[PDB]
């Protein structure tokens, strides 16, 4: 079987969650996926899975044990409010924002800089010219 143990439980009212260190004992196995940790920490601490965040998990040399950090928000909405974006995307709570690469965006920015005004009037002027 696999055991999970929470230690150093700190209550955090003004961010409305609980902090702790997760120790996962997994004999005869590689490790536990974060999703399974989230769902059962939800079961034990008795919160909805979405309010549960788990990260920073490292297995000890030789295997059989891992240690990470766990957060249990008082509500799903509170988790959505305070909790980092990239991790919500990890949990699917947020959708990945599609953006172009930094060089592309900077080129867009500079070329936008060289135009003045909306430019629609320039567009119609050149259209009439040609």
């Amino acid at each position: 079987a696999v055991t999970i143990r929470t230690r150093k439980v700190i209550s955090n009212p003004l961010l409305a969650r609980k902090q702790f260190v997760v120790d996962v004992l997994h004999p005869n196995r590689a490790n536990v996926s974060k999703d399974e940790l989230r769902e059962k920490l939800a079961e034990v601490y008795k919160a909805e899975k979405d309010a549960v965040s788990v990260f920073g998990f490292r297995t000890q040399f030789g295997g059989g044990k891992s240690v990470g950090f766990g957060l249990v928000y008082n509500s799903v909405a509170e988790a959505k409010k305070f909790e980092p974006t990239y991790r919500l995307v990890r949990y699917g709570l947020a959708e990945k924002v599609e953006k172009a690469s930094r060089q592309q965006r900077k080129q867009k920015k500079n070329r936008d800089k060289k135009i003045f005004g909306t430019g629609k009037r320039l567009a119609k002027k050149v259209a009439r010219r040609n």
């Binding site: 079987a1 696999v2 055991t3 999970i4 143990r5 929470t6 230690r7 439980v9 702790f20 059962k40 079961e43 034990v44 601490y45």
Partner: peptide
């Protein structure tokens, strides 16, 4: 104090 658990 924390809580303890086990599955499978």
């Amino acid at each position: 104090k924390g809580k303890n658990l086990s599955f499978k």
